[PDB]
Amino acid sequence: DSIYVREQQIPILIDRIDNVLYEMRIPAQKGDVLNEITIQIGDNVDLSDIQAIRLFYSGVEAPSRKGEHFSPVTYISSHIPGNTRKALESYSVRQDEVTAPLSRTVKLTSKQPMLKGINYFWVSIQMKPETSLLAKVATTMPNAQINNKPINITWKGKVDERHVGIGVRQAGDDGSAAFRIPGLVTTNNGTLLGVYDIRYNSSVDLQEKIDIGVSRSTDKGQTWEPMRVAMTFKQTDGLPHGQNGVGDPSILVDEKTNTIWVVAAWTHGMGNERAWWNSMPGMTPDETAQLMLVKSEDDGKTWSEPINITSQVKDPSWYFLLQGPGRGITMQDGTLVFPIQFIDATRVPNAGIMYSKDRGKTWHLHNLARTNTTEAQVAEVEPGVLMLNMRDNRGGSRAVATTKDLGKTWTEHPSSRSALQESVCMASLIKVNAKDNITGKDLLLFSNPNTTKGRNHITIKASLDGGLTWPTEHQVLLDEAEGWGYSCLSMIDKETVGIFYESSVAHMTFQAVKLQDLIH
Amino acid sequence: SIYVREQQIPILIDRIDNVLYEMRIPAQKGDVLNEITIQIGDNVDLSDIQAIRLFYSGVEAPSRKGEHFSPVTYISSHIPGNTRKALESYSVRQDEVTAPLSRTVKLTSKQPMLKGINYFWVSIQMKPETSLLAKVATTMPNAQINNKPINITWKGKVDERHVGIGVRQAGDDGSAAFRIPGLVTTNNGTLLGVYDIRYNSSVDLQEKIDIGVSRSTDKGQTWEPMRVAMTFKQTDGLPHGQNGVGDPSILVDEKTNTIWVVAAWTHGMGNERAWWNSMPGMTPDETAQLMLVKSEDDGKTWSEPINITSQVKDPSWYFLLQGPGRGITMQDGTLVFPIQFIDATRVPNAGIMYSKDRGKTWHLHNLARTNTTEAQVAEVEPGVLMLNMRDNRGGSRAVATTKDLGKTWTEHPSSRSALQESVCMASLIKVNAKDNITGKDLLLFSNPNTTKGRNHITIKASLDGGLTWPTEHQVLLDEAEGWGYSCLSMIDKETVGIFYESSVAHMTFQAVKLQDLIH
Ligand SMILES: [Cl-]
Ligand SMILES: [Cl-]
């Protein structure tokens, strides 16, 4: 008899009741019993952070299912509204449980007689809610017993150390079916502000009833204040809220004043279809998507009424002008900058940037950085040099360009279409100055689904040479599984980078990673 | 100009909103639908109407293909726990008139329209105590845009709308969905509506599914709390999700009033469909189990499940199960349930199983017809069982008769011609001349009356033993798309009951006077 066990590098949410530590598949005969397994927690793990460890039985696999798998269903949902934190009772039956205080070796037992075929068991770990976001969970499963006889385990995936995280927003929270399109900044007071679409009815893009929400943390992501609606258009002009959506937020901190700016696209009318195919040439809300700004002058607690800046930057011939989701920046000289994207008169989308030299009162947009590109993020790679990292519809890899004149003229970067692979998805890029971090060196930090197939392997990558190279040694995989893929980075302090992203375990997931783990 | 559509869809007495009419108006920016008139029919009881509302629902996206009468589904029958009131996300109330209603209802709006196709709709709310036999005839004789009358181009109109009750709707009692209706009327006049409780999704077995019963002692006006008639929870320690029981069929033993429900329990089989995972053999680990429960107190309490698999299943068959809906008591006291099995050649076949000893022992002889699945049975004449079958060849119901409890079968002239279908469950019942107001023997049939999709849920009557189904003796109940299953039962001498999956609720009950069908 054989036992196949897989561990994936997926976040252990501190706010979840269950977290999939290990999944086990056992091709067995009728009557077989997994009488015992041993979980050996690592010596460097802080045992006092662990609330519980559980063994679950999840029945048998269907003969009709194609391929080989490690579960018959997703054990813990990130989709079912209001039921995303605890193991789905429909599909898993608890065999055993060890609760706090945990010792270094944990033995879990079962009396379950298996059925003939592929049987599934899995191990759950529960962390205490106050657990440090920097805590790591190293474990192994050195022993397993079937019918009281030792069985050697066949490993089909193993991780050195697991990371924790917090599901800031989950399916169904505050009556919203979904949350998407992450943006993250750290204010001058060290406050973390996470921005996103509040996708009330479904996970689809505009047009739909969508508002801009903001979650605020004053303790580096350990706890998040109740969600605030930063922007909404409700029943503007008498149209239903479903035909008055605002979405795809981008957030920036004016670092000279601590004023926080969020830009989003308001779509008006356009039925229940996607706004990408219904925003048309013109300027009015009836004709085209509206570029809207809100500001906070109290560290993200309260937000101004929306400010319509469409007329300042949209050409009438364009079908659609909107921000690139995620974040914007303050340049060294105090210039505020947001990435943008527009569908031109020839129906081709293009990435670029808009900026303000007067603290966000007036905005300017020059020329496109590259044709057939969409979502992009901007970083000041060197003083007065903006680097734009772009979602490229050609597929396979991020396009990269720079400008020294705020986007009048652009230069393709050596790393463009070669250094950073992608499946055509949003990606995050930030600059970290040597003075402001523990490595004492300038850094670019990038995050995306690190693959050309689907959206998985959410990874943070660091560059020490202005984005020319991204060494494998200086990367950290955070989410091996499939998700919606968008992410946004921001330095929490001098020693830690924060990532606010769409993961396999939560719609808005926050994680903290030490820079010492990335570099060194 | 202005295009308006009325569909023959049930007006639920238990909803807050129901779509009376849908309007699409191609307009210029700033156009105002300042007034519309609803003229309620002269025979309508105005005291049953709680309110009528005018809604504005924005404009259509230019990117959408074809012509439509709404940008979204205005009142959901799918969103768990949000299926009774118009979705606020997509409709803005313009005007409202509340009880006591007047025969003529003027509804106004001040909304400046956008350039494009603008949507307006009219909602009707009934009072919850409204008679299930109440009919609502209306017209919209006038409409004004920019203080000028505008000719209305009709793209669908109904003579009279029927009411109904959404006995089960998405999210009720924590179940995402409900499917597979079965309906009987006991010897006490009690209606018992059986269905799958599909807790996690609308998918078939395998899944966490129980058998539910909704009981009514007032001809469907109100329904008692759901009773779980059968469940296997965590049998043998497996999850409930790998222990579903479904596709119920119910019958009244008319000799004793004992009520019997037969369902299929599937054990193990992952999270895939039991149709592809029930295997040859006899144990729960191998194959779907044919389970029975009984009620000796008019459907109020139910016995522990009784496994009858060994009495009627051949080991070579992949899957033996009941034909969902209902069974019968024959004139001589024989209990009969339709059945279906996938044989060793992997071909499904309809048939019937029967009991001569009040449900203690069951017997199953020969298949009625090859490559058929769900069927319903009725004693068309004393001693003659007529089986009406879902046929995989497509397009039409197969019909066969037997005089020896399924040892031999005779194809009926009506077979594969008289009753069109899209390959879906259909209900058949017999009504004796002495037991109904017409004084004639009747066969009553219900299915999605179409060969394309599942729609136009229609009750058909036959006065000639199922040879003909004259268009004049039919009643369309649900013009829109739905899951399509239905089950018929006479409520009393004058009215037929239908318990079905409709476009407006997972379990919909309606009552229809036989005088609406015949004459
Ligand atoms: Cl075996
Ligand atoms: Cl649960």
Side-chain angles (χ1 to χ4, degrees), chain A residues 1-115 117-360 362-452 454-520, chain B residues 1-433 435-451 453-518:
Chain A
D1 201 339
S2 290
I3 297 178
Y4 304 89
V5 184
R6 180 184 72 183
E7 182 181 19
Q8 289 178 317
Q9 183 69 299
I10 61 179
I12 296 177
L13 299 188
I14 67 176
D15 59 313
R16 271 186 153 188
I17 302 305
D18 291 293
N19 295 287
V20 184
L21 185 68
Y22 296 109
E23 299 193 321
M24 314 175 67
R25 64 189 303 277
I26 304 179
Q29 296 179 20
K30 184 175 174 180
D32 289 344
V33 182
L34 179 64
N35 65 282
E36 196 185 66
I37 62 165
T38 312
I39 298 299
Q40 187 66 33
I41 301 167
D43 295 340
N44 300 336
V45 184
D46 186 348
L47 292 172
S48 59
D49 295 334
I50 307 176
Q51 179 54 48
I53 294 177
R54 281 180 281 275
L55 178 62
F56 283 112
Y57 178 62
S58 293
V60 296
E61 187 49 84
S64 78
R65 198 181 180 186
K66 301 180 183 181
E68 301 187 343
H69 307 269
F70 282 90
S71 63
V73 292
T74 308
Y75 295 136
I76 314 171
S77 187
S78 63
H79 168 79
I80 297 166
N83 194 3
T84 64
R85 293 170 174 79
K86 181 172 183 282
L88 296 176
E89 294 188 11
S90 291
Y91 312 121
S92 297
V93 179
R94 191 180 71 193
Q95 304 297 290
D96 201 357
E97 183 181 74
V98 179
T99 65
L102 278 71
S103 65
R104 200 68 57 182
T105 306
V106 179
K107 301 295 186 69
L108 297 165
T109 64
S110 176
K111 299 184 169 64
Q112 180 56 37
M114 294 180 221
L115 286 58
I118 299 293
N119 290 251
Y120 295 117
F121 292 79
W122 64 281
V123 179
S124 187
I125 187 172
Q126 186 181 355
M127 306 304 302
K128 294 186 185 166
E130 70 274 23
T131 297
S132 172
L133 290 171
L134 303 179
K136 295 160 183 177
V137 179
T139 68
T140 49
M141 189 192 288
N143 188 222
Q145 303 286 131
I146 295 188
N147 303 329
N148 304 311
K149 302 181 178 198
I151 298 291
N152 292 315
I153 298 175
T154 299
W155 289 95
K156 294 290 190 183
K158 188 72 185 68
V159 172
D160 290 332
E161 55 181 24
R162 297 284 284 281
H163 297 270
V164 303
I166 189 171
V168 176
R169 301 277 78 192
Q170 303 184 36
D173 287 350
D174 294 310
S176 185
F179 298 89
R180 280 212 70 196
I181 319 308
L184 184 71
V185 293
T186 307
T187 78
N188 293 356
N189 297 359
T191 309
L192 298 174
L193 294 172
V195 71
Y196 44 80
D197 283 13
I198 306 168
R199 300 194 166 185
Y200 295 91
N201 299 330
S202 65
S203 65
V204 299
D205 300 341
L206 298 158
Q207 183 60 292
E208 250 295 0
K209 174 183 169 181
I210 302 182
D211 291 334
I212 301 301
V214 177
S215 294
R216 183 168 177 276
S217 180
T218 59
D219 62 12
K220 305 182 156 174
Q222 292 296 161
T223 72
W224 296 82
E225 296 180 340
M227 176 185 69
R228 298 168 164 88
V229 170
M231 214 181 319
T232 182
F233 293 86
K234 301 196 180 183
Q235 298 184 346
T236 295
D237 302 320
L239 269 69
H241 198 175
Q243 299 194 6
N244 264 313
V246 55
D248 286 30
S250 195
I251 186 170
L252 75 72
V253 176
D254 176 4
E255 299 179 355
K256 308 304 176 190
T257 67
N258 202 40
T259 299
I260 313 307
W261 290 92
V262 174
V263 60
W266 170 45
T267 55
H268 185 61
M270 312 179 186
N272 193 235
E273 299 288 1
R274 306 291 72 73
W276 188 260
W277 311 122
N278 292 283
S279 188
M280 294 296 171
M283 223 69 153
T284 72
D286 290 357
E287 297 169 320
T288 209
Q290 298 292 298
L291 199 65
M292 310 301 297
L293 286 181
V294 299
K295 57 161 178 172
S296 172
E297 291 176 304
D298 60 1
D299 203 53
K301 299 180 81 180
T302 69
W303 299 87
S304 73
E305 294 295 330
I307 305 173
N308 196 324
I309 66 171
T310 311
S311 76
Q312 299 176 27
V313 291
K314 193 196 167 288
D315 191 274
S317 68
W318 302 341
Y319 284 68
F320 205 155
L321 171 63
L322 71 162
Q323 65 288 333
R327 61 181 304 170
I329 64 174
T330 306
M331 296 184 75
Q332 187 168 307
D333 77 350
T335 303
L336 306 182
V337 181
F338 274 126
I340 55 75
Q341 47 176 326
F342 64 93
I343 298 181
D344 66 26
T346 67
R347 301 150 189 167
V348 183
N350 313 283
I353 63 186
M354 63 166 188
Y355 65 91
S356 177
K357 294 181 180 175
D358 63 0
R359 318 254 59 78
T362 72
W363 294 85
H364 303 269
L365 166 45
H366 294 301
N367 302 309
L368 64 89
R370 180 170 165 81
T371 68
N372 203 12
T373 58
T374 55
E375 298 169 346
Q377 290 290 259
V378 66
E380 183 174 29
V381 62
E382 290 295 340
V385 183
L386 296 172
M387 169 178 285
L388 193 67
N389 188 302
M390 294 159 285
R391 176 166 167 162
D392 191 329
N393 289 321
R394 295 161 188 75
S397 53
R398 303 296 293 177
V400 183
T402 59
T403 175
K404 293 177 171 60
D405 55 16
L406 309 171
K408 293 180 188 285
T409 63
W410 293 89
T411 301
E412 181 156 41
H413 193 264
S415 66
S416 189
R417 302 291 295 175
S418 51
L420 296 169
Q421 71 182 332
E422 61 147 0
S423 58
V424 192
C425 187
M426 189 265 176
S428 183
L429 177 66
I430 60 170
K431 165 73 172 303
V432 186
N433 289 327
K435 175 188 165 182
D436 301 313
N437 78 104
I438 201 64
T439 75
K441 300 178 182 182
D442 295 329
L443 303 175
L444 292 183
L445 293 181
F446 171 87
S447 74
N448 89 333
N450 189 27
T451 178
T452 62
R455 293 182 185 172
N456 50 70
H457 294 81
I458 306 303
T459 302
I460 302 178
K461 306 183 169 173
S463 169
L464 282 165
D465 57 10
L468 289 165
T469 69
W470 300 90
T472 309
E473 184 191 359
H474 302 138
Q475 302 185 358
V476 176
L477 174 64
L478 293 175
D479 189 16
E480 192 171 327
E482 197 74 5
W484 290 326
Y486 290 31
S487 60
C488 196
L489 299 164
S490 186
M491 292 290 290
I492 297 157
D493 53 18
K494 298 198 169 188
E495 303 174 3
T496 307
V497 61
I499 187 173
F500 191 56
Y501 75 105
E502 304 173 327
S503 78
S504 64
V505 295
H507 286 196
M508 295 288 139
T509 308
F510 183 77
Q511 287 189 283
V513 171
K514 286 183 172 74
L515 275 61
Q516 288 169 337
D517 292 17
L518 278 166
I519 299 79
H520 295 278
Chain B
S1 61
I2 287 192
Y3 306 86
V4 185
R5 188 182 67 182
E6 188 183 12
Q7 293 187 303
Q8 184 67 283
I9 48 177
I11 298 180
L12 294 181
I13 65 187
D14 61 318
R15 279 185 151 177
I16 302 298
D17 289 297
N18 299 275
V19 178
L20 189 66
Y21 294 103
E22 293 189 328
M23 312 180 70
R24 63 191 306 277
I25 308 185
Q28 292 281 46
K29 185 190 172 192
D31 285 340
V32 182
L33 182 69
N34 59 290
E35 202 183 68
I36 62 176
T37 308
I38 305 300
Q39 183 63 36
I40 299 159
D42 292 322
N43 301 333
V44 178
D45 190 352
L46 293 170
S47 68
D48 293 339
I49 310 174
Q50 178 56 37
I52 293 178
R53 276 180 280 280
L54 177 62
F55 282 110
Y56 176 63
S57 298
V59 299
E60 186 55 87
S63 73
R64 192 173 183 191
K65 291 203 61 174
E67 295 185 343
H68 304 272
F69 284 91
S70 64
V72 298
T73 301
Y74 296 134
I75 316 174
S76 189
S77 66
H78 169 87
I79 298 166
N82 196 356
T83 63
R84 291 178 177 79
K85 187 166 178 286
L87 293 166
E88 293 192 354
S89 292
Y90 313 117
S91 298
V92 177
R93 188 178 61 193
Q94 304 298 289
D95 204 356
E96 168 171 288
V97 293
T98 58
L101 268 76
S102 47
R103 192 67 59 189
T104 304
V105 180
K106 304 296 186 70
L107 293 166
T108 65
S109 169
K110 296 175 172 62
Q111 177 60 35
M113 291 182 234
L114 284 60
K115 181 179 172 294
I117 302 296
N118 290 252
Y119 293 118
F120 289 82
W121 63 283
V122 181
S123 176
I124 188 169
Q125 187 180 348
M126 308 304 292
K127 297 179 180 177
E129 68 275 22
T130 294
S131 173
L132 289 170
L133 302 177
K135 289 150 160 187
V136 185
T138 66
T139 52
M140 187 191 299
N142 195 259
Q144 305 280 321
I145 288 175
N146 298 328
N147 302 276
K148 294 171 175 59
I150 181 160
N151 286 299
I152 298 179
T153 306
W154 289 95
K155 300 297 182 187
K157 190 72 186 67
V158 182
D159 287 359
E160 70 192 354
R161 297 280 287 278
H162 301 257
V163 299
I165 187 169
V167 181
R168 303 275 70 186
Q169 306 185 32
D172 288 348
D173 299 323
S175 177
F178 299 89
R179 287 211 64 196
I180 320 308
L183 184 68
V184 292
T185 313
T186 72
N187 290 356
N188 299 311
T190 311
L191 299 169
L192 299 176
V194 68
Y195 44 80
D196 279 7
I197 304 172
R198 301 192 169 187
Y199 294 93
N200 296 326
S201 71
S202 60
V203 307
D204 289 344
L205 293 167
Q206 182 67 290
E207 251 292 355
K208 179 180 167 185
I209 309 185
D210 294 334
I211 306 302
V213 177
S214 287
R215 182 168 180 274
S216 174
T217 57
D218 58 12
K219 302 187 184 182
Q221 295 297 153
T222 69
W223 298 83
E224 294 181 342
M226 174 172 70
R227 294 172 166 87
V228 173
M230 211 180 320
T231 183
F232 294 89
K233 295 181 185 303
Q234 293 180 355
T235 296
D236 299 343
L238 268 71
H240 200 162
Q242 296 194 10
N243 263 313
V245 54
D247 297 16
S249 191
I250 187 164
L251 71 78
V252 181
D253 176 353
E254 298 176 350
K255 304 302 183 182
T256 66
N257 201 50
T258 298
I259 309 303
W260 292 90
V261 173
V262 66
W265 167 46
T266 53
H267 184 63
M269 317 193 182
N271 197 235
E272 300 291 350
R273 305 295 70 73
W275 189 261
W276 312 118
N277 289 286
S278 189
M279 293 289 147
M282 222 74 66
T283 79
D285 289 8
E286 297 164 315
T287 201
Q289 300 293 297
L290 194 54
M291 312 302 265
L292 288 178
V293 293
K294 66 180 191 173
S295 178
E296 297 184 333
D297 61 357
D298 202 44
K300 289 183 66 164
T301 63
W302 297 87
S303 68
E304 285 293 339
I306 305 162
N307 193 320
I308 60 164
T309 306
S310 68
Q311 299 180 23
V312 294
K313 193 189 178 295
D314 188 273
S316 69
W317 303 340
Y318 286 75
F319 200 169
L320 172 61
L321 70 163
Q322 61 291 331
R326 68 178 297 166
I328 61 172
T329 295
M330 298 185 65
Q331 181 165 291
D332 65 10
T334 309
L335 306 180
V336 177
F337 270 126
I339 55 73
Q340 46 174 328
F341 62 96
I342 305 176
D343 61 31
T345 60
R346 300 152 182 162
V347 175
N349 313 280
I352 58 184
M353 73 168 185
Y354 69 90
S355 178
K356 290 189 173 176
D357 59 1
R358 308 259 65 82
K360 200 200 80 173
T361 67
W362 295 84
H363 306 284
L364 172 50
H365 300 311
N366 303 322
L367 63 90
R369 178 177 167 84
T370 62
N371 203 19
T372 53
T373 56
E374 301 164 337
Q376 288 287 270
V377 70
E379 185 172 23
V380 66
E381 301 295 345
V384 186
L385 294 175
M386 158 178 286
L387 191 67
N388 185 299
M389 295 169 274
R390 171 169 171 157
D391 196 320
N392 286 326
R393 299 159 187 76
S396 60
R397 302 293 292 183
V399 183
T401 62
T402 178
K403 307 179 187 186
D404 50 17
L405 299 166
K407 289 177 178 290
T408 62
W409 292 92
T410 294
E411 183 179 347
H412 200 260
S414 72
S415 191
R416 304 287 291 157
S417 56
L419 296 174
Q420 71 181 346
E421 70 155 349
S422 58
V423 190
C424 183
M425 185 268 171
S427 176
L428 190 67
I429 59 174
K430 177 66 178 307
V431 184
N432 296 318
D435 301 324
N436 76 103
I437 195 59
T438 69
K440 295 176 185 173
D441 291 348
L442 300 174
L443 285 181
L444 298 179
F445 177 85
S446 71
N447 88 327
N449 186 32
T450 182
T451 60
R454 289 179 185 185
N455 53 74
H456 296 85
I457 303 304
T458 300
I459 299 181
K460 302 186 172 177
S462 170
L463 287 162
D464 61 7
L467 180 65
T468 65
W469 304 88
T471 305
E472 54 268 28
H473 298 141
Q474 304 184 1
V475 177
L476 172 61
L477 291 176
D478 190 17
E479 184 167 354
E481 194 75 14
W483 291 328
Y485 287 37
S486 61
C487 196
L488 299 174
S489 193
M490 290 298 302
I491 306 171
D492 53 36
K493 295 186 183 301
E494 306 181 359
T495 315
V496 67
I498 186 176
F499 191 57
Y500 75 110
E501 303 169 329
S502 76
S503 63
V504 298
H506 290 197
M507 294 290 142
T508 310
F509 182 81
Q510 290 182 285
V512 179
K513 292 195 186 70
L514 272 55
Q515 290 171 337
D516 287 18
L517 286 171
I518 300 79

